[PDB]
Design a protein around this ligand. Structure first.
Ligand SMILES: NC(=O)c1cnn(CCO)c1
Ligand SMILES: [Cl-]
Ligand SMILES: [Cl-]
Length: 163
């Protein structure tokens, strides 16, 4: 566990993270994909061996000794708002289980279902609140990665609000 478990946010490529493991925003088929998933494929391609897993689940595959947690959020183009919300909450709950099992002191995590799985809606708050619900009972340092300058400010504000 971290000595004083924290949340932080950085605006940069999650493939350059300084944490003990990474959460991939994976597809269910273990394909290279696009966005975070393609960055993760280029950095840790060995972690895509038997990484396919259903929506709402996470599956960990080691790249050397570095754990890649493949978390499959719902594509809101295909899911109803109700069932997509349930699957998005469930994926983050499975991430917290994996982070705990691995015994890591820190994890790098993207906001699941906020990019090409968002069904064209802003889901910052929805996705971040499900991240907090899952991760608040864990003692890992959590570092959230994002790419947009306005999203960085809003995630930082949400973290600081609770402190
Ligand atoms: N390498 C990355 O962390 C990354 C690339 N694209 N995205 C999602 C759109 O900003 C994240
Ligand atoms: Cl970068
Ligand atoms: Cl972003």
């Amino acid at each position: 566990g971290a000595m004083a478990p924290s949340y932080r946010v950085k605006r940069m490529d999650i493939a350059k993270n300084d944490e003990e493991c990474v959460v991939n925003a994976a597809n269910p088929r273990g394909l290279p994909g696009d966005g975070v998933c393609k960055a993760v494929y280029k950095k840790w391609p060995e972690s895509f061996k038997n990484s396919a897993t259903p929506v709402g689940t996470a599956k960990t595959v080691m790249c050397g000794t570095y754990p890649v947690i493949h978390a499959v959020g719902p594509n809101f183009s295909n899911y109803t708002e109700s069932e997509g919300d349930r699957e998005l909450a469930a994926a983050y709950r499975e991430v917290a289980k994996e982070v705990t099992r691995l015994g890591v002191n820190s994890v790098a995590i993207p906001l699941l279902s906020t990019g090409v799985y968002s069904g064209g809606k802003d889901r910052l708050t929805q996705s971040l609140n499900h991240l907090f619900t899952a991760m608040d009972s864990t003692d890992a340092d959590v570092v959230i990665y994002c790419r947009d300058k306005e999203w960085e400010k809003k995630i930082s504000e949400a973290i600081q609000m609770r402190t």
